[PDB]
Amino acid sequence: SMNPPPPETSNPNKPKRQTNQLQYLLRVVLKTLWKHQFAWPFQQPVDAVKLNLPDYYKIIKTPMDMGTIKKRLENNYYWNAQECIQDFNTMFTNCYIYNKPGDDIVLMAEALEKLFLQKINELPTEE
Ligand SMILES: O=C1CCCN1c1cccc(NS(=O)(=O)c2cc(Br)ccc2Br)c1
């Protein structure tokens, strides 16, 4: 039933960088998905209490959301692009794991993920 602490967005002893790929992940990828009409369910951690989903964090053991990704990018939390790409993929995968095909939230994730794929196809070469 209860919500877990959200994923961390700050960790001072975690090494981090600001690469051109991570800049693109913020300025292009996150920005594109964030403004989308279907972004809102994904702009913050799942509130299992308010949404009345008491089994959500029994099923989903690696939660992720764009609110978290946004703060991680703004805070330069990542070492490399792959870490951030993995967070997006975790977010999408969690949605598909928890819900059933054709649910509204799945259609919404599919729309965002199509755009995600189109943008990472154009990920720049590093440096
Ligand atoms: O799986 C995820 C990841 C992000 C939110 N989420 C999720 C899954 C199941 C229900 C809800 N509750 S909700 O946000 O009010 C909702 C949203 C939409 Br769109 C359609 C119906 C409902 Br009910 C949320």
Look up the CATH number of the domain holding residue 35.
Answer: 1.20.920.10
Q: Is residue 5 part of a domain?
A: no
CA atoms within 13 A on the CB side of 109: 23
Domain count, the chain: 1
What residue has token string 């975690």? 14
Instruction: Provide the domain limits for residue 73.
Output: 19-123
Is the shortest distance between the CB of 60 and ligand 1 below 6 Å? no
Q: Is residue 52 part of a domain?
A: yes
Method for this entry: X-ray
The residue contributing the CA closest to ligand 1 atom 12 is: 51
**SS3 state of residue 32:** helix
**Using an 8 Å Cβ cutoff, are 68 and 8 in contact?**
no
Q: How far is the CA of 98 from the centre of ligand 1 (A)?
A: 10
Q: Is residue 9 part of a domain?
A: no
Q: Is residue 110 part of a domain?
A: yes
Q: Which two tokens stand for residue 7?
A: 């994923």
Residues 6+ apart with CB under 8 A from 82: none
